[PDB]
Amino acid sequence: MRVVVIGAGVIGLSTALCIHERYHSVLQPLDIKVYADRFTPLTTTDVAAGLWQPYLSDPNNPQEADWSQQTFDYLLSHVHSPNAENLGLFLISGYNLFHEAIPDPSWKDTVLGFRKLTPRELDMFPDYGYGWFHTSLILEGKNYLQWLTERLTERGVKFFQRKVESFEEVAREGADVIVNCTGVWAGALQRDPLLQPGRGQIMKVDAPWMKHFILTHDPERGIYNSPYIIPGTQTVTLGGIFQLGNWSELNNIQDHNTIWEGCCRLEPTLKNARIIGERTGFRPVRPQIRLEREQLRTGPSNTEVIHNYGHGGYGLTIHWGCALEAAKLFGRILEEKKLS
Amino acid sequence: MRVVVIGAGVIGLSTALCIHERYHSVLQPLDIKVYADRFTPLTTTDVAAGLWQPYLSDPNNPQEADWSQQTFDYLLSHVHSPNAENLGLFLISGYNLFHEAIPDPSWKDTVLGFRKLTPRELDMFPDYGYGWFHTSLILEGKNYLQWLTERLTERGVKFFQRKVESFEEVAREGADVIVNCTGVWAGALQRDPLLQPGRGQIMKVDAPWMKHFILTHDPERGIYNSPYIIPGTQTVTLGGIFQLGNWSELNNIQDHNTIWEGCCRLEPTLKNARIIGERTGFRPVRPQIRLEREQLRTGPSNTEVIHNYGHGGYGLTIHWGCALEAAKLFGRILEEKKLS
Numbered sequence: 001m002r003v004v005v006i007g008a009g010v011i012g013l014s015t016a017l018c019i020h021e022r023y024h025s026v027l028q029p030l031d032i033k034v035y036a037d038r039f040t041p042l043t044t045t046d047v048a049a050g051l052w053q054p055y056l057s058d059p060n061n062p063q064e065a066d067w068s069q070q071t072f073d074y075l076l077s078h079v080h081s082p083n084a085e086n087l088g089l090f091l092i093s094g095y096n097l098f099h100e101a102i103p104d105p106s107w108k109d110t111v112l113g114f115r116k117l118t119p120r121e122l123d124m125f126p127d128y129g130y131g132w133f134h135t136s137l138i139l140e141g142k143n144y145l146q147w148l149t150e151r152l153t154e155r156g157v158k159f160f161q162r163k164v165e166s167f168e169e170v171a172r173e174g175a176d177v178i179v180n181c182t183g184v185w186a187g188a189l190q191r192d193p194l195l196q197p198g199r200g201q202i203m204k205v206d207a208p209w210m211k212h213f214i215l216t217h218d219p220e221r222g223i224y225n226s227p228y229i230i231p232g233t234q235t236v237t238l239g240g241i242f243q244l245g246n247w248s249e250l251n252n253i254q255d256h257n258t259i260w261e262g263c264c265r266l267e268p269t270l271k272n273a274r275i276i277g278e279r280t281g282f283r284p285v286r287p288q289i290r291l292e293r294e295q296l297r298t299g300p301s302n303t304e305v306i307h308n309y310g311h312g313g314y315g316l317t318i319h320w321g322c323a324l325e326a327a328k329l330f331g332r333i334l335e336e337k338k339l340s
Numbered sequence: 341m342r343v344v345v346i347g348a349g350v351i352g353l354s355t356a357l358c359i360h361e362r363y364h365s366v367l368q369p370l371d372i373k374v375y376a377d378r379f380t381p382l383t384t385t386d387v388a389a390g391l392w393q394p395y396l397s398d399p400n401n402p403q404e405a406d407w408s409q410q411t412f413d414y415l416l417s418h419v420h421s422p423n424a425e426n427l428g429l430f431l432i433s434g435y436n437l438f439h440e441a442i443p444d445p446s447w448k449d450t451v452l453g454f455r456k457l458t459p460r461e462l463d464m465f466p467d468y469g470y471g472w473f474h475t476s477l478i479l480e481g482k483n484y485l486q487w488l489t490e491r492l493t494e495r496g497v498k499f500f501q502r503k504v505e506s507f508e509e510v511a512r513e514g515a516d517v518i519v520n521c522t523g524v525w526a527g528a529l530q531r532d533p534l535l536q537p538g539r540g541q542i543m544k545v546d547a548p549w550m551k552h553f554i555l556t557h558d559p560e561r562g563i564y565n566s567p568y569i570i571p572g573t574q575t576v577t578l579g580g581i582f583q584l585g586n587w588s589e590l591n592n593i594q595d596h597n598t599i600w601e602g603c604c605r606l607e608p609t610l611k612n613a614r615i616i617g618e619r620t621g622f623r624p625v626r627p628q629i630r631l632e633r634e635q636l637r638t639g640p641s642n643t644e645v646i647h648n649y650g651h652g653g654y655g656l657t658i659h660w661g662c663a664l665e666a667a668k669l670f671g672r673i674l675e676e677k678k679l680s
């Protein structure tokens with residue numbers, strides 16, 4: 001069978017890998033190709049810090065809770081494997097700061113060592129009066145993506161750089177299944193008004209003395225829109241920008257300053273941190289992830305489509321559970337073709 | 341008054357600074373000079389990771405508990421000051437792992453967010469079945485010492501590189517007070533059989549994905565003698581060697597292997613961590629810190645001596661409280677000379 005994955009961000013490469021893993025032994029030939037117009041260094045995925053953390057509150061689809069946790073559990077089980085620095089996976093503890101009390105997150109038990117911040121800890125952060133501490137996981141995109149590529153390449157999965165203009169063009173080329181993992185740009189293949197960009201900007205800084213993450217929460221500013229600091233392997237991520245509908249892939253001076261001054265306020269030690277880089281990206285915002293099947297009509301033959309996009313600011317957090325769900329959908333397609 | 345501080349490790353440079361801070365405004369001239377035979381890069385203090393952590397259990401002198409805490413409190417209050425990276429001071433959380441249950445440490449409340457390790461956390465460390473998690477502080481010697489040197493130099497404190505053969509030679513030179521902060525080598529100046537070296541060796545490794553500390557505890561091997569990993573600013577410290585009475589300042593192959601293999605076991609991700617350096621040093625082991633006065637007789641004139649040594653493996657942990665205690669002792673000397 002001929003499978004075409006459109007997209008080479010986390011969702012794409014993940015799904016690809018997941019499908020190949022689970023079906024390659026059971027499909028006559030399983031021919032999987034990845035089509036993407038941008039690869040690693042240049043994806044939204046490579047701009048992400050990679051911190052595992054879902055939305056605070058119980059969503060539209062609570063199946064997303066399950067997917068985030070399946071991912072957490074999966075990563076945690078390879079955190080101590082000699083392979084982990086190749087996937088850019090490591091454990092990290094830190095703070096969630098709020099101006100007043102709030103309910104414990106659903107995922108409070110998924111993470112390691114969840115607890116409420118003590119007063120002496122809150123004294124370190126004058127502007128916030130309540131919060132949490134826990135241990136979570138960081139999966140760095142730049143690495144993860146490269147890791148995924150290597151696995152895929154070894155499994156015979158071929159990569160092509162191209163902008164796909166239509167599902168039809170791909171089907172007409174003889175794809176049996178199109179897995180659509182196109183992120184913020186999915187609407188160009190099939191209009192989806194519920195999908196929009198959540199523009200972000202981040203700074204990368206040399207501040208290696210920083211061992212914890214600090215995420216602030218501000219109802220006035222909203223999700224992803226208040227100061228955060230997330231230490232990584234080579235560099236500390238400074239962020240706090242969320243701009244719905246903004247399609248400008250250009251670093252903005254005002255946003256730079258907003259990030260810089262919010263983070264320096266959050267942690268004064270930052271003031272002399274050397275700036276290494278700055279990047280913008282597009283969160284594929286949507287009320288729900290679209291993870292589902294669809295048969296495209298096109299010709300005497302109908303083409304099977306697995307949509308897998310709209311993962312907002314929690315795509316690394318959620319990717320594995322989605323990838324496995326995408327894999328079940330594929331297996332169902334096979335059971336229909338009576339190909340297993 | 342003429343004061344001679346012997347020693348330019350943390351204890352010396354601290355005490356120096358502390359005495360100058362508190363008395364310079366009240367002493368006609370306060371002439372302070374530091375004599376030391378080795379400075380920064382080459383002190384025991386520069387081989388220390390810098391992790392604040394006292395002995396688990398209530399000691400001989402419980403005044404040491406108060407000193408450790410005064411140091412903790414004092415550091416915590418500057419952790420978020422734009423100055424902190426200059427002293428090499430930062431916050432860091434991590435693990436204490438034991439083979440079975442044990443009582444909470446005395447300092448359980450001094451630290452941030454103390455708690456018992458949960459099962460899922462213990463599953464990460466197959467060889468241990470109990471433990472703690474908390475947040476503490478690291479103060480890196482190489483930096484701290486450099487910071488202390490700069491403060492002192494600005495306060496007119498003069499430094500000389502010399503090996504002092506006797507308290508007498510210093511007193512004869514016209515010192516009014518000798519502050520003895522000679523660490524493991526104090527016995528050469530006045531025999532002290534209770535003082536001995538706790539030889540240590542450490543590796544410094546590039547493992548920047550490592551954001552927590554891990555201290556293991558083994559009654560069979562004893563204090564400082566089982567595997568530890570303590571992330572720093574530029575590098576991760578691998579240790580787990582304690583050899584009482586060993587005066588060999590030479591990296592040992594066996595100990596290297598011991599450290600390497602214990603830490604790799606502790607955290608498999610280390611296996612591909614690049615080795616940056618390796619260093620040995622002498623913990624000035626004693627049943628108690630010697631922090632006290634003594635009048636040397638020498639000639640028609642008696643010389644005042646403040647001893648401040650024997651800080652084992654917790655000198656950075658304890659240094660500030662000792663430094664303030666030494667400063668009181670100095671003030672008392674002044675009140676005797678009726679010089680205030």
Ligand SMILES: Cc1cc2nc3c(=O)[nH]c(=O)nc-3n(C[C@H](O)[C@H](O)[C@H](O)COP(=O)(O)OP(=O)(O)OC[C@H]3O[C@@H](n4cnc5c(N)ncnc54)[C@H](O)[C@@H]3O)c2cc1C
Pocket residue numbers: 006007008009010011012035036037038039043044045046047048049050051052053162163164165181182183184185186188189199200201202239280281282283284309310311312313314315316317318
């Ligand atoms: C500032 C910022 C911080 C973030 N931080 C985190 C975090 O800490 N933790 C977390 O979980 N997530 C984080 N994210 C979220 C994460 O980056 C996204 O959810 C995720 O990267 C989206 O993955 P994707 O595969 O859906 O998209 P992408 O990585 O954008 O990949 C989409 C792919 O589709 C290709 N494509 C699109 N259209 C076509 C076409 N028509 N033809 C061919 N190819 C096409 C593109 O070239 C690209 O390969 C953050 C996002 C941003 C912007």
Ligand SMILES: Cc1cc2nc3c(=O)[nH]c(=O)nc-3n(C[C@H](O)[C@H](O)[C@H](O)COP(=O)(O)OP(=O)(O)OC[C@H]3O[C@@H](n4cnc5c(N)ncnc54)[C@H](O)[C@@H]3O)c2cc1C
Pocket residue numbers: 346347348349350351352375376377378379383384385386387388389390391392393502503504505521522523524525526528529538539540541542579620621622623624649650651652653654655656657658
């Ligand atoms: C492997 C290892 C790991 C450690 N880890 C930690 C840790 O993580 N946290 C922590 O709290 N502490 C730690 N320590 C402990 C800390 O290193 C010591 O307690 C502390 O460094 C001792 O400080 P000092 O001033 O007492 O000795 P030093 O730093 O050795 O300074 C003594 C000074 O006296 C001078 N001197 C001696 N004799 C003479 C003389 N006769 N004439 C002139 N000068 C003289 C020397 O040149 C030197 O300048 C560690 C120690 C080791 C060895």
Ligand SMILES: O=c1[nH]c2ccccc2cc1O
Pocket residue numbers: 051052053054200215224228239240241283312313314
């Ligand atoms: O999009 C984002 N996603 C995240 C997910 C987890 C933790 C922080 C963030 C910050 C962002 O800017």
Ligand SMILES: O=c1[nH]c2ccccc2cc1O
Pocket residue numbers: 391392393394540555564568579580581623652653654
């Ligand atoms: O001497 C040491 N002192 C310490 C103090 C605190 C935590 C770890 C250590 C390890 C050592 O080897």
